[PDB]
Amino acid sequence: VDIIFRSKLPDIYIPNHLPLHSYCFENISEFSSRPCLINGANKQIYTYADVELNSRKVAAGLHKQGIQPKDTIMILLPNSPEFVFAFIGASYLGAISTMANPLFTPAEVVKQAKASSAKIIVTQACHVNKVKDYAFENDVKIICIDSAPEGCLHFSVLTQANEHDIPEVEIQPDDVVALPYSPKGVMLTHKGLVTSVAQQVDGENPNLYIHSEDVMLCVLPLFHIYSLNSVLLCGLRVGAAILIMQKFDIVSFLELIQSYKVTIGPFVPPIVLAIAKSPMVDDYDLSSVRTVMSGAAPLGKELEDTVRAKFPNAKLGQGYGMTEAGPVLAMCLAFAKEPFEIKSGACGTVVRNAEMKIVDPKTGNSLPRNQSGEICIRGDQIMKGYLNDPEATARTIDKEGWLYTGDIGYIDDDDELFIVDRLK
């Protein structure tokens, strides 16, 4: 009988026996013809029908390239449609996507490629130098999304494959599907990610209310779990438009927000500082943005004031995330369909269908409200473990299923989480 905390919302039914793709597209028929991915640079629009078909084609293509269930591909791509097709294609096969920052060094990319046992690297022509001769010696294929160099395949060999050549497969809930690194490979499963997505956007009163006429700006990098999950996956679930920006600069960012009337803005302190200093911000209609969320460190008081002055209809709020946790441990309840009050400085309320407690690090004993200790969470959304490192897993998830974040915070009288130390 510890002191356990739960969400202010009720639990919901979570269909986490479904594979990730079957869950994200479960309600595709309600929005088959709506915009799904919008490429900000060239304005190309893929509907939900196109996105699913493209992902299944990519899956058959990966199959023809020798990817079997539980094999791993690496995505070394900026935000782009191809990132999505690769990621979802690997999921259709029951295979694993490890994603990496394309601006990594050769030594960085290669170390992740070998720890993850990646059979294919999907990349841009301009980055092939970093891996081309590593790939060569270890029979790892290279596929480029813009143009193949001598010894690589062009991504059309996947996107043009026959969708009905996807092999019959028996995906299990605990099968790994996503392997971001944090450096340790964090094994996220179909069950985890479906749970995490449902805890965020499903239910009669969703913790984060998004619907199929929203436009979500996808400028935060998809190779970080924060956006992979809370923008792409959640957006797919509810049928929203995912307006992809491949790299941030302030002008096209304001341009895309006005022209596409972005309603959901996943920002980070470096973005709001660009907004603060850019003279041209006052020359754009940004009234479409109704929800702004932080994906990294908290904005602070000045940056929060910038968002309130430049985005007049934007609700502002802070969550709390960690890669091993799914990533989302807590969500801002001001974003709920039927909103709750919040408080400056708070990092949200623990997700529904989960338990949280605060563990004094000397004792090991759960703490009351308004006292600081290590944040711990438990639920189906958390990782399965670190890849090939059972010991580091055993020090991070205990025997009762509790994940120890290493962050110090407390929960106050209104079930609002406050974090006081993130430096481990």
What size, in residues, is the chain?
Answer: 424
User: Considering only 166-174, 222-230, 308-316, 404-412, which stretch makes contact with Ca ion by CB under 5 A?
Assistant: 166-174
User: Considering only 111-119, 159-167, 206-214, 393-401, which stretch makes contact with Ca ion by CB under 5 A?
Assistant: 159-167
Taking the complex as a whole, the smallest distance from the CB of residue 5 to Ca ion amounts, in Å, to 32
Of 173 and 269, nearer to Ca ion (C-beta) is 173
Helix %, strand %, coil % of the chain (to 5): 35, 20, 45
User: Considering only 53-61, 93-101, 147-155, 157-165, which stretch makes contact with Ca ion by CB under 5 A?
Assistant: 157-165
Number of chain positions touching Ca ion (CB under 5 A): 2
User: Considering only 160-168, 336-344, 387-395, 398-406, which stretch makes contact with Ca ion by CB under 5 A?
Assistant: 160-168
Instruction: Name, in order, each residue with C-beta under 8 angstroms of 130's C-beta and a sequence gap of 6 or more.
Output: 104, 105, 106, 109, 110
Residue 19 tokens read as 């594979």
Taking the C-alpha atoms of residue 91 and residue 96, their distance in angstroms, rounded to an integer, is 7
Contact assessment for residue 370 and residue 215, using Cβ atoms and an 8 Å cutoff: no
Of 57 and 132, nearer to Ca ion (C-beta) is 57
Residue 110 tokens read as 């290669």
Of 19 and 185, nearer to Ca ion (C-beta) is 19
Tell me which of 105, 129, 156, 162 binds Ca ion, using CB under 5 A.
162
Q: Could you say which residues in the range 224-243 bind Ca ion, by CB under 5 A? A: none
* Contact between 344 and Ca ion per CB under 5 A: no
Taking the complex as a whole, the smallest distance from the CB of residue 163 to Ca ion amounts, in Å, to 7
Instruction: Name, in order, each residue with C-beta under 8 angstroms of 409's C-beta and a sequence gap of 6 or more.
Output: 347, 358, 372, 373, 375, 417, 418, 419, 420, 421
* Helix boundaries (H) for 261-408: 269-277, 301-310, 390-394
Of 86 and 171, nearer to Ca ion (C-beta) is 171
Of 178 and 350, nearer to Ca ion (C-beta) is 178
Of 21 and 290, nearer to Ca ion (C-beta) is 21
What is the side-by-side strand order in the sheet with 141-144? 153-154, 141-144, 118-123, 72-75, 96-99, 176-178, 186-189, 385-386
How do 373-378 and 403-411 pair as beta strands?
antiparallel
Peptide bond into 266 cis (omega under 30): no
Of 50 and 324, nearer to Ca ion (C-beta) is 50
Taking the complex as a whole, the smallest distance from the CB of residue 53 to Ca ion amounts, in Å, to 10
3-class SS at 405?
A: strand
Taking the mean position of all CA atoms in its chain, how far away is CA 279?
Answer: 32
61 is in an annotated binding site: no
Q: Could you say which residues in the range 248-287 bind Ca ion, by CB under 5 A? A: none
331 is in an annotated binding site: yes
Q: Which residues are annotated as a binding site for (E)-caffeoyl-AMP?
A: 226, 230, 296, 319, 323, 331, 407, 422, 424
Q: Which residues are annotated as a binding site for AMP?
A: 319, 323, 407, 424
Q: Which residues bind Ca ion (CB under 5 A)?
A: 162, 171
